[PDB]
From a paper:
Our previous work identified NP338 as an immunodominant CD8+ T cell epitope in individuals expressing HLA-B3739. Our conservation analysis of the NP338 viral peptides across vaccine and circulating IAV strains, including pH1N1, H5N1, and H7N9, found 16 natural variants of NP338 peptide, with the most common mutations occurring at position (P) 5, 6, and 7 of the peptide. To understand the molecular basis of cross-reactive TCRαβ recognition, we solved the structure of NP338 and its variants bound to the HLA-B37 molecule, as well as the structure of a cross-reactive TCR in complex with HLA-B37-NP338. Thus our data demonstrate that CD8+ T cell cross-reactivity in the context of NP338 peptide and its variants is favored by similar conformations adopted by the epitopes.
Author numbering:
A (entry chain A): 1 to 276
B (entry chain B): 1 to 9
C (entry chain C): 1 to 99
Write the structure that this text describes.
Amino acid sequence: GSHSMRYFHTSVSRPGRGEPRFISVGYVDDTQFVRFDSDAASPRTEPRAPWIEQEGPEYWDRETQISKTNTQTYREDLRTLLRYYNQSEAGSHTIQRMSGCDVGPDGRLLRGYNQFAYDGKDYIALNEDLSSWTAADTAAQITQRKWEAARVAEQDRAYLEGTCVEWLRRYLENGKETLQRADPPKTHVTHHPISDHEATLRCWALGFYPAEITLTWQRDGEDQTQDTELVETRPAGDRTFQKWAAVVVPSGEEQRYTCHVQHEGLPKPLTLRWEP
Amino acid sequence: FEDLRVLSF
Amino acid sequence: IQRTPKIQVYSRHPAENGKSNFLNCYVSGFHPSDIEVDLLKNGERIEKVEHSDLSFSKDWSFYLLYYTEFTPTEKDEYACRVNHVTLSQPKIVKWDRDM
């Protein structure tokens, strides 16, 4: 189906504890494939998936230099935002960036991204047109004016339409065994009495890839969104993901509840019930 | 593949 | 403005007594990124626990997976202990095979 590539940058200041650390991680869909950490004893862009290991020395050397230079740019940006927000040099602050591209089944560009946050709040984002910016506040409007004057969006657009989509297509081919394989969820329902009056029904999904899934409970065919406890989808550590959804049911009414599972790996959505 | 940041804030 | 971590403690595979597995503690939804996570066996810290590389979600909140190889038994108690600037005291979440 459709696929994504994303790079996640985090830079965090630590006044009195040296210079801000910079981390860059890269993903294709829900698979991490590269990392760089400026706090490592010998910072280097390193492989994190088997299918990227085949890239030659020039790939590793070029990406390492890019991340070493980006480390410095983010340190400059942290100093800049202390000025733009009238903040002291005493506190710790964070800049984040997410950038990348989505492609369809034919490998054509669906959309690009280049967006930033300061202290966990939106700062500036490239709009979907890849030609204009959304600034969150008057500080980000200063960056917007600077970036409009320098025609930054044109340069970001060229990377997102060219390099990003070309390398994502290459990675998808090189990693086709895993990146292009959906693992459906293994599902079951558990039952636990809470008291003489109620019991919990928990619908499990395990071992699935990619992470996107829909897990819902119905009571007499009606969605129980407000009454369902739904945990965040979580990594198992073997590439796959897990999720559960639970409902508290009146004793003796268990068969009125059905669990519904939708996932890319399933040709047809599943319906499950507690099977005593 | 990721490129250099285009420009500082 | 800060965001407190959500914490889930669980195993990689369904737990079977005497079968090697992985104990996971997944912390997510937090901001800022500095966080302290320990995995505990009968209240004591497990040494050399590994963790994933720092990343974040669409809402900018961070997530990390801490994990260690373990062989569960009927008597051994496992937990995850988390500290973050948003918490007055460490938060302990016990491992429950059914969660």
